[PDB]
């Protein structure tokens, strides 16, 4: 019967812990200027006058990349092509290991379309830029190059970004 517990256990007191105040804002800014100086004077040398070195036509179409006799002969087996009515054919280049590519030429209407399959590498600047060149010849015979395509297995290249340039005189 009866009881007491009786407490006095309870804290009072008042916290209070703070301080901070400083800043930063100096050392590491602006770099040194690159010097950059040009010259040069490029050593010219005449043409020296011979002789036409004896040739002949050359078996496929290997030659070096951005030789012009290569171009041409890329523009002849077309020409040739064309003549004899067909306009899907296969050839040795180089690379080596592409071994044949696929060259296709579309006939519509007086417009023509050229596809060829094969892969990325320097050999497609020098054949690229003899298509411009190819249309020419073949605006000769009659037809006109208009549409071209390459791709090393399928074309696909969803991808257009160019917002810039914007000044004026």
């Given at each position: 019967?009866?009881?007491?517990?009786?407490?006095?256990?309870?804290?009072?007191?008042?916290?209070?812990?703070?301080?901070a105040?400083?800043?930063?804002?100096?050392?590491?800014?602006?770099?040194?200027?690159?010097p950059?100086?040009?010259?040069?004077?490029?050593?010219?040398?005449?043409?020296?006058?011979?002789?036409?070195?004896?040739?002949?036509?050359?078996?496929?179409?290997?030659?070096?990349?951005?030789?012009?006799?290569?171009?041409?002969?890329?523009?002849?087996?077309?020409?040739?092509?064309?003549?004899?009515?067909?306009?899907?054919?296969?050839?040795?280049?180089?690379?080596?290991?592409?071994?044949?590519?696929?060259?296709?030429?579309?006939?519509?209407?007086?417009?023509?379309?050229?596809?060829?399959?094969?892969?990325?590498?320097?050999?497609?600047?020098?054949?690229?830029?003899?298509?411009?060149?190819?249309?020419?010849?073949?605006?000769?015979?009659?037809?006109?190059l208009?549409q071209?395509?390459?791709?090393?297995?399928?074309?696909?290249?969803?991808?257009?970004?160019?917002?810039?340039?914007?000044?004026?005189?």
């Amino acid at each position: 019967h009866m009881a007491s517990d009786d407490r006095a256990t309870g804290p009072a007191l008042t916290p209070l812990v703070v301080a901070a105040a400083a800043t930063s804002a100096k050392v590491e800014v602006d770099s040194p200027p690159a010097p950059v100086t040009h010259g040069a004077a490029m050593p010219t040398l005449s043409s020296a006058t011979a002789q036409p070195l004896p040739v002949a036509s050359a078996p496929v179409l290997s030659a070096p990349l951005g030789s012009h006799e290569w171009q041409q002969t890329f523009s002849q087996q077309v020409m040739l092509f064309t003549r004899q009515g067909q306009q899907s054919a296969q050839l040795r280049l180089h690379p080596e290991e592409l071994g044949q590519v696929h060259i296709s030429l579309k006939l519509d209407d007086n417009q023509a379309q050229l596809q060829m399959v094969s892969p990325h590498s320097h050999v497609r600047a020098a054949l690229e830029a003899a298509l411009p060149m190819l249309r020419t010849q073949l605006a000769e015979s009659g037809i006109q190059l208009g549409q071209s395509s390459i791709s090393s297995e399928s074309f696909a290249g969803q991808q257009q970004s160019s917002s810039q340039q914007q000044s004026s005189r």
